[PDB]
Amino acid sequence: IPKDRRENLQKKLFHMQQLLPNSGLPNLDRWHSLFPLDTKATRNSTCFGYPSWMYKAQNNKNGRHFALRRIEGYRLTNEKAILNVTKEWKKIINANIVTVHEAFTTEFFGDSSLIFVYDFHPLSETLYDHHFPPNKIPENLLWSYVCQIANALLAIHNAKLAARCLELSKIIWENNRIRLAACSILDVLHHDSPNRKTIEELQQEDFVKFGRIILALATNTPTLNFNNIDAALATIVPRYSTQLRGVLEWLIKPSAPGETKTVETLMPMIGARFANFANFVMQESDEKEFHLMRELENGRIARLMFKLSVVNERWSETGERLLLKLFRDYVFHQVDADGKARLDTNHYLNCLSKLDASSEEQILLTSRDNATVFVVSYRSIRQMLDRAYGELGKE
Amino acid sequence: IPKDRRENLQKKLFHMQQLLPNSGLPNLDRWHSLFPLDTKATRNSTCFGYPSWMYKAQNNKNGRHFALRRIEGYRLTNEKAILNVTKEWKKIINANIVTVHEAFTTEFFGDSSLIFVYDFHPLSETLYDHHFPPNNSHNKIPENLLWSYVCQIANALLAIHNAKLAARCLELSKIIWENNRIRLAACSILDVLHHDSPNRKTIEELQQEDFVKFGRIILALATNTPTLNFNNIDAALATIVPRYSTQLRGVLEWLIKPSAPGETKTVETLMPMIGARFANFANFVMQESDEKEFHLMRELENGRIARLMFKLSVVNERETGERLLLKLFRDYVFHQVDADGKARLDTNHYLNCLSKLDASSEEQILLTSRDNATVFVVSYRSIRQMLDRAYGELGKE
Ligand SMILES: Nc1ncnc2c1ncn2[C@@H]1O[C@H](COP(=O)(O)OP(=O)(O)OP(O)(O)=S)[C@@H](O)[C@H]1O
Ligand SMILES: Nc1ncnc2c1ncn2[C@@H]1O[C@H](COP(=O)(O)OP(=O)(O)OP(O)(O)=S)[C@@H](O)[C@H]1O
Ligand SMILES: [Mg+2]
Numbered sequence: 001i002p003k004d005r006r007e008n009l010q011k012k013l014f015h016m017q018q019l020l021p022n023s024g025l026p027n028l029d030r031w032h033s034l035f036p037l038d039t040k041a042t043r044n045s046t047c048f049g050y051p052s053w054m055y056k057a058q059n060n061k062n063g064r065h066f067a068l069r070r071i072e073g074y075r076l077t078n079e080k081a082i083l084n085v086t087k088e089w090k091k092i093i094n095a096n097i098v099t100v101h102e103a104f105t106t107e108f109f110g111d112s113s114l115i116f117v118y119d120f121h122p123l124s125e126t127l128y129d130h131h132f133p134p135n136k137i138p139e140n141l142l143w144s145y146v147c148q149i150a151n152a153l154l155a156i157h158n159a160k161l162a163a164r165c166l167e168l169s170k171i172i173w174e175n176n177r178i179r180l181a182a183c184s185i186l187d188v189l190h191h192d193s194p195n196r197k198t199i200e201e202l203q204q205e206d207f208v209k210f211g212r213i214i215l216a217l218a219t220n221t222p223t224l225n226f227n228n229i230d231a232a233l234a235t236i237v238p239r240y241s242t243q244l245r246g247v248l249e250w251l252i253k254p255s256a257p258g259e260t261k262t263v264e265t266l267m268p269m270i271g272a273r274f275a276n277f278a279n280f281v282m283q284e285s286d287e288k289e290f291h292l293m294r295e296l297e298n299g300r301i302a303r304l305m306f307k308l309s310v311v312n313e314r315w316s317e318t319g320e321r322l323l324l325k326l327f328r329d330y331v332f333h334q335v336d337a338d339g340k341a342r343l344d345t346n347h348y349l350n351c352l353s354k355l356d357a358s359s360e361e362q363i364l365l366t367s368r369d370n371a372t373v374f375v376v377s378y379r380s381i382r383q384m385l386d387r388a389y390g391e392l393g394k395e
Numbered sequence: 396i397p398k399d400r401r402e403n404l405q406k407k408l409f410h411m412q413q414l415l416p417n418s419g420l421p422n423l424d425r426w427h428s429l430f431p432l433d434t435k436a437t438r439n440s441t442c443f444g445y446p447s448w449m450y451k452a453q454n455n456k457n458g459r460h461f462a463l464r465r466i467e468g469y470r471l472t473n474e475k476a477i478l479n480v481t482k483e484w485k486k487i488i489n490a491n492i493v494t495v496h497e498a499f500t501t502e503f504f505g506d507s508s509l510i511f512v513y514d515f516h517p518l519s520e521t522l523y524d525h526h527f528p529p530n531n532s533h534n535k536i537p538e539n540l541l542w543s544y545v546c547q548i549a550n551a552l553l554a555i556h557n558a559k560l561a562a563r564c565l566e567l568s569k570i571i572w573e574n575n576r577i578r579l580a581a582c583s584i585l586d587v588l589h590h591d592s593p594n595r596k597t598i599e600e601l602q603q604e605d606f607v608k609f610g611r612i613i614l615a616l617a618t619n620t621p622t623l624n625f626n627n628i629d630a631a632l633a634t635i636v637p638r639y640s641t642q643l644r645g646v647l648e649w650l651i652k653p654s655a656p657g658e659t660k661t662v663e664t665l666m667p668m669i670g671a672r673f674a675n676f677a678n679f680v681m682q683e684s685d686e687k688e689f690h691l692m693r694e695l696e697n698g699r700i701a702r703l704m705f706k707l708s709v710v711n712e713r714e715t716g717e718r719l720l721l722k723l724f725r726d727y728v729f730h731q732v733d734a735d736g737k738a739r740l741d742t743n744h745y746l747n748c749l750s751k752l753d754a755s756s757e758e759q760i761l762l763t764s765r766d767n768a769t770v771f772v773v774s775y776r777s778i779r780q781m782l783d784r785a786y787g788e789l790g791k792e
């Protein structure tokens with residue numbers, strides 16, 4: 001657990017518990033301690049047709065943290081069966097889709113608001129805000145985005161559904177991992193609108209919105225228009241590979257001369273980039289595995305110190321336990337040439353690691369009166385510790 | 396953190412430390428504590444042309460555990476065979492390839508042996524032994540798992556071929572399995588043992604042999620036939636059509652058959668054939684990596700608990716003052732005895748006390764001194780603040 005990852009995982013735990021008491025936010029029937037997640041001071045109705053609000057809240061029943069998406073000013077009776085379509089989205093298990101649990105309307109916000117509950121992903125930021133704060137992205141990261149979004153659309157389309165909402169502000173970023181964070185919403189907000197589209201047509205719009213998102217990132221232009229669909233498409237050939245340009249072209253262009261666009265057709269176009277991506281995720285999962293084991297090592301190290309602390313100053317004054325006493329002094333009571341304490345976390349860690357591994361390496365244990373000195377190995381010290389601790393269990 | 400997952404990580408750590416006191420194995424110039432990994436009492440020379448031995452050993456320099464592949468009865472007749480091979484393979488780092496570090500000869504085994512050192516992956520079992528258990532004899536593997544293998548092996552071949560090299564050794568017994576993660580565990584070996592052989596093959600045909608050996612491995616697993624023969628490359632190929640999808644059959648057929656009518660087989664051509672199965676595979680890996688992320692944060696308490704023990708051990712027994720409560724706190728946590736006088740050992744008590752110390756719990760405890768006249772009512776929160784305070788005053792010096 002190096003410095004950055006350990007404090008990042010602590011920053012995550014800190015974000016999950018994080019509260020803001022004076023905010024003047026209401027408590028729902030099954031939710032409390034609502035925490036505002038919006039990082040910007042402006043809200044527009046371009047994405048949903050209504051203003052949107054984001055919240056982190058605690059469940060009254062299980063105490064775990066969830067994310068709440070609020071759609072301001074939407075009227076719909078809570079008892080309506082349409083809100084239950086989130087149950088179909090719940091069935092979809094995907095790493096690039098934020099799982100939705102349920103949907104309900106509420107009036108605790110002083111109006112008519114619709115609430116979607118999602119998994120809470122700590123330290124998440126929108127893909128827009130991450131790449132466009134108020135200078136080009138590497139192609140590997142762009143392909144990582146292409147592979148992740150395609151993976152999401154694959155599961156969605158095969159579930160006889162569509163993304164509907166596919167934009168930069170509605171995709172959350174967290175350590176290069178992206179997820180669709182507004183699914184199942186438009187399913188409700190467009191259930192009985194004029195000019196309803198088919199799930200077949202909506203699935204096609206996904207591919208178009210897909211291409212535009214990546215194209216925007218590739219051309220480093222936040223606002224994207226139709227008048228430059230071929231202008232910005234030709235700007236990526238020297239900077240990025242022709243393969244990247246080819247995928248963007250396929251996604252954006254209305255490919256309907258003899259056939260309709262399908263996710264299965266998109267996959268071979270990606271091809272080798274999937275292997276590269278999968279390789280990276282596998283290696284990152286490997287790194288998480290070592291940190292897991294290091295942390296489990298810490299537990300074994302803590303349990304060794306438990307035994308050691310039980311024995312010390314408890315019989316314990318003199319004997320084979322006297323060496324255990326002197327061993328503790330060796331590890332934690334180190335002082336400099338002046339006489340001042342030499343605090344050293346590294347020394348503590350490596351001493352106990354060698355004790356846990358029963359290292360054959362030897363160390364010098366000086367007695368209280370610097371007259372007697374013990375040449376002893378970690379292996380011997382470990383065996384004395386287990387021996388003495390067991391003799392206390394006989395009682 | 397499910398039951399099996401915690402015990403899996405504990406089985407790994409226990410496997411790395413595992414020793415054999417009665418062993419008659421020597422210590423090498425740079426290696427010691429050699430531990431036998433072989434699951435069988437018999438060794439044949441089919442895989443390498445020489446008997447092979449597997450060992451876990453500790454590095455004298457860094458103290459970490461590595462895997463050692465020993466090739467019995469090998470004399471170095473050319474230093475080019477080790478150096479021209481290992482200089483290229485050492486550079487290749489892949490998630491589906493066991494990293495090789497170096498190769499050297501030794502005589503400590505009472506003979507002339509060649510030694511390869513690899514990364515040590517705990518709890519690893521050969522893909523053969525996992526799907527064909529050793530202690531049983533002669534019922535199908537799920538298709539998703541077969542596709543997982545195809546993606547992983549293809550990923551390995553992708554890195555290998557792009558380095559102008561070949562797997563050479565691509566068989567069930569030379570691939571290690573660990574929680575559905577497979578790795579090529581015999582790379583760079585045949586590169587050395589065949590470095591100056593009479594009938595040296597081209598790097599391109601050896602690469603073609605990779606695809607064939609690829610196909611046979613998956614086909615063997617799909618047909619539940621450990622040994623695979625040339626006479627049933629089309630017979631066993633027809634056993635998979637009702638049980639598995641036609642796509643799998645198409646890939647296996649493509650891999651095994653000498654596909655050179657209009658083009659020669661390349662990994663880039665294999666990728667679109669797998670296609671959507673890569674999305675499925677990557678999704679699972681992402682999902683498992685997500686599950687580890689949540690499990691990590693929960694486990695982080697061990698570091699926080701251990702660092703607290705560091706502070707507590709530094710301060711204690713270095714006599715009187717505010718640290719006297721820290722001394723009495725240690726007595727409360729680890730020195731519990733009954734009215735009778737017997738030791739009250741409790742691993743749970745130790746863990747939960749420190750959890751409350753780590754959480755700065757508002758829960759209160761009773762601290763009676765040796766002199767019973769004064770007793771301190773204090774919470775874990777206050778004790779926690781006293782500990783950091785005392786530990787900080789030692790940093791002033
Ligand atoms: N499912 C989620 N889990 C955790 N955090 C989230 C989730 N969804 C959104 N957030 C965070 O909430 C913040 C705001 O959410 P997004 O609303 O949808 O963007 P919004 O920028 O504030 O844009 P406006 O104008 O509504 S469209 C972002 O910074 C995210 O980091
Ligand atoms: N790099 C490694 N890291 C950890 N364990 C390994 C590694 N490589 C091999 N092993 C294990 O070592 C054991 C024996 O190695 P493998 O020898 O090559 O099996 P072996 O099948 O009996 O084949 P050989 O003797 O040619 S017949 C296996 O159970 C593996 O799981
Ligand atoms: Mg918002």
Ligand SMILES: [Mg+2]
Nearest residue numbers: 433447448449
């Ligand atoms: Mg062997």
